Amino acid sequence: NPWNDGDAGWRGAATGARANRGRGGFRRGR
RNA sequence: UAUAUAAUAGAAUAAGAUAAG
DSSP states (O other): OOTTOSOOGGGGSOOHHHHTSOOSOSOSOO
């Protein structure tokens, strides 16, 4: 899709919904 | 889409000299 123009947006944002769909343990830490 | 859990037992029965206050 060209209209996205390299912008993931909400699907690739930092929102709590996207940060609550992984199980890594947050051990190493960003 | 993750690297991890830990429980079964039993027996009846005694040796004995220190150069002291």
